[PDB]
Amino acid sequence: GFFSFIGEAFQGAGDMWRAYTDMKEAGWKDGDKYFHA
Amino acid sequence: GFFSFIGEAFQGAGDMWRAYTDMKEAGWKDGDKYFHA
Amino acid sequence: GFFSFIGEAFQGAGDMWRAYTDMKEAGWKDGDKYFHA
Amino acid sequence: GFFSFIGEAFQGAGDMWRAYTDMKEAGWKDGDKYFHA
Amino acid sequence: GFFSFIGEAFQGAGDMWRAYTDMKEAGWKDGDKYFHA
Amino acid sequence: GFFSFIGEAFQGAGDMWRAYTDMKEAGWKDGDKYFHA
Amino acid sequence: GFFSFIGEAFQGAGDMWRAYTDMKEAGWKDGDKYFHA
Amino acid sequence: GFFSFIGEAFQGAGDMWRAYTDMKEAGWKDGDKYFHA
Amino acid sequence: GFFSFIGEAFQGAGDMWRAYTDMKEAGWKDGDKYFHA
Amino acid sequence: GFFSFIGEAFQGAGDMWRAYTDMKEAGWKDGDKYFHA
Amino acid sequence: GFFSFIGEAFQGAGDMWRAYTDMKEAGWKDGDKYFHA
Amino acid sequence: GFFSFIGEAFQGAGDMWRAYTDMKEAGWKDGDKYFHA
């Protein structure tokens, strides 16, 4: 894949550029994400 | 794939540029996402 | 695929540029998303 | 595919540019999405 | 496919530019979407 | 296909630019959509 | 697309089931094909 | 796409089931193909 | 894509099930193919 | 992609199940292929 | 990608299941392939 | 990727299950391959 980003990126809560690869018989659990202003 | 982004990107809560690949017999669970202003 | 974006992108709660690929015997669960203003 | 976007994009709750590809014997579940103003 | 968009796009709750491709023996479930103003 | 859009697009609840392609033995379910003003 | 072939297919010289997809700013050149009997 | 082939396929010289995908600023050159009997 | 082949496939000289994907600023050159009987 | 092959496959000279992926500023050269009987 | 092969595969000279991936500023050269019977 | 092979595979001269990955500023050269019977 190809991606070109120019400028600003904002994230309050969470993940950025996560790459999970080549898994077998795996499990996981992600929590909740909250944003308050 | 090809993507070109110029400018600003805003996310309050969640994931950006997530890439899950090559999985077998996998499982997972993502939580809830909240935004308040 | 090809995509060209120029300007601003806003997301209160959720995912952006998610790419799930090459899965076998997989499962998952995404939560709810809330926006309040 | 080809897409050209110029200007602003707004999303209160949900996903943007989701790409699910090459799946076999897969399952998942997405939650509800709420918008309040 | 080819698409050219110039201007503003607004979504209260839901998905934008979703691309599901190359699936076999798959299943999923999307939730409800609410808009209040 | 070819599409040219100039101006504004508004959606209260639902999907925009959804592209489902190359499916075999698939199933899914979409929820209800509500708009209140 | 959908195709169902039952029987024999013969080709002396050339390509079969060629699929070129999603190209931008591309070029190529194919040669000549000869058949003698 | 969908294809179902039952029987025999013969090729003297060339390619079968070629799939070129997602290219940008690419170039190539294929040679000649000869068949003699 | 989907393909189902049942039976025999013969190739004297060349490629089978070639898959070139996700290229940028690439070049190559293929040679000639000869068949004699 | 999906492919199902049942039976025999014969190749005198060349490649089978070649997969080139994710290349940038690349070059190469393939030779000639000969078949004699 | 997904592939299912049942039966026999014969190659006189060349490569099988070649996978080149994630290259930048690369070059190479493959030789000729001969088959005699 | 996913591959399932059941049966026999024959190669006279060449490579099988070659996997080249994550290269930068690389070069190489492969020789010729001959088959005689």
Author numbering:
A (entry chain A), B (entry chain C), C (entry chain E), D (entry chain G), E (entry chain I), F (entry chain K), ...: 1 to 37
Paper text:
SAA1.1 is an acute phase protein that becomes strongly upregulated during inflammation. Chronic inflammatory conditions, such as tuberculosis, leprosy and rheumatoid arthritis, are risk factors for the development of systemic AA amyloidosis. We report three cryo-EM structures of SAA1.1-derived amyloid fibrils: one that was extracted from the diseased murine tissue and two that were formed from murine SAA1.1 protein in vitro. In vitro and ex vivo fibrils possess parallel cross-β sheets but differ in their overall topologies and fibril protein folds.
